[PDB]
Amino acid sequence: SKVVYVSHDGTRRELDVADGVSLMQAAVSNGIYDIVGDCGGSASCATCHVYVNEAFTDKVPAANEREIGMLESVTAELKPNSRLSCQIIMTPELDGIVVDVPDRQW
């Protein structure tokens, strides 16, 4: 399934992500270092922060308590559509989803 990562400078990168893989795993596995899973993907850091395109913000599963609490630690601006990419798990239903990588993760 397709996932589009948009850098701060507008650079777009499209990856084919398998079912069950998180957006953080796909990013780090394909050189999108601007996203770094410091904690390893267990919602214990905020370095995998991304902005889910408003066209998918209400499709993807809502953030749980752990994520909501960890989001307050993001270094970039915390927007309404801010999410931790390690919490977004790919499925065919998310094909075409677009996420913007923040200017910084620290």
What does the binding site for ligand FES look like in residue numbers (CB under 6 A)?
24, 37-39, 41, 43-48, 70, 84, 86
The answer to whether 48 is annotated as binding is: yes
Query: Which C-beta is closer to ligand FES: that of 10 or that of 25?
Result: 25
The answer to whether 45 is annotated as binding is: yes
Contact assessment for residue 106 and residue 63, using Cβ atoms and an 8 Å cutoff: no
b/e per residue, 64-94, with b = 16+ CB within 10 A? eeebeebbeebebeeeebbbbbbbbebeeeb
Query: Which C-beta is closer to ligand FES: that of 4 or that of 71?
Result: 71
The answer to whether 78 is annotated as binding is: no
Q: How many residues does the chain have?
A: 106
- Residue numbers in the known binding site for [2Fe-2S] cluster are 39, 45, 48, 86
